[PDB]
Structure formats: C-alpha cells, structure tokens
C-alpha cells in the first residue's frame, strides 16, 4: 500500500489476531504454543510433498 514499514513479527501476528476478532493478549500469552503449532504445520506440508 506504499513503502515497506518494519514491525516485529509477533506484533504483526497480534494485529492479525485482532483482524479476526480475538484480543491480542491471547496471542502474547500463547506465543510459544502458537509458534510450535505453525512450525509443525509447515513441517507437515513438505512431508506430504
């Protein structure tokens, strides 16, 4: 939408949780589990491929 403006990635993930109706404390208080789940989900794609 213009020039790239940097933001830390967990803070971008919190904006995106807001965009679906969940408060952002739910992301910050679960950060490690959410990242573990994303990593297992990405590791399952290359296994199916």
């Amino acid at each position: 939408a213009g020039a790239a403006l940097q933001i830390p990635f967990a803070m971008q993930m919190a904006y995106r949780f807001n965009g679906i109706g969940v408060t952002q404390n739910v992301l910050y208080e679960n950060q490690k589990l959410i990242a573990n789940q994303f990593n297992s989900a990405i590791g399952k794609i290359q296994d199916s491929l």
Binding site: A1, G2, P8, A10, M11, T23, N25, Y28, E29
Partner: protein
C-alpha cells in the same frame, strides 16, 4: 477493503466516466508518507499488571512512552482509558516498565 481492487493505497472513493465502448474509473486512495522509526513494545508492566493498547501501538521517542494510532503518528500519554489490563507481567516476551496514569485519583487530590 479488498486490496488493489480499487487502485494502490487505501481506497477512499471512486468516480466513473464513460468512454467509447468502455468505462474509466478514477480511484482516489490514501497513501502514507514520511515515516519515522521508533522503539516499540507489546505490553507495559505497572503494579505487577500487563497493559495492552486498546487501539494503537506503544512507541518510544527515546526516553518517553506513548500510544499512537497505527497509521498516522499522533502520540498520547498512556492512561487507563488508553489501555486494558490482562494478567501479570511475567508471561509476555518483551514487556517494558512504565507508569500508567489514572485520571480519577489526581482529580480527587
């Protein structure tokens, strides 16, 4: 709100014009400009409680902390009407110490 469906930027409004066998759309959009960098933090710890912005981000100009809206820089001081509380400050990665100002009790002298 569909990205790039009505031009580049944040769609404000669009005007139609007729062409021969066709149509022309003049899209008016909003484009952000002249950014500055800041230090930032996800929450703020005060009295053993974690504070999150209601809307906006916590930013630091070098020595002081403010809340701003995310798309236009307009800094304000962090109060209990700017933020909400959840939990204690032991669980959030990158939490920062600052004071969150209450209006009522300095009204009550």
């Amino acid at each position: 709100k569909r990205v790039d469906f009505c031009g580049k930027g944040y769609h404000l409004m669009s005007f139609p014009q007729s062409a021969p066998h066709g149509v022309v759309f003049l899209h008016v959009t909003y484009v952000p400009a002249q950014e500055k960098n800041f230090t930032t933090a996800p929450a703020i710890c005060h009295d053993g409680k974690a504070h999150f912005p209601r809307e906006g981000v916590f930013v630091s100009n070098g020595t002081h902390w403010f809340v701003t809206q995310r798309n236009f820089y307009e800094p304000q001081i962090i109060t209990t009407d700017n933020t909400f509380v959840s939990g204690n400050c032991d669980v959030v990665i990158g939490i920062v110490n600052n004071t969150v100002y209450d209006p009522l009790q300095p009204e009550l002298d």
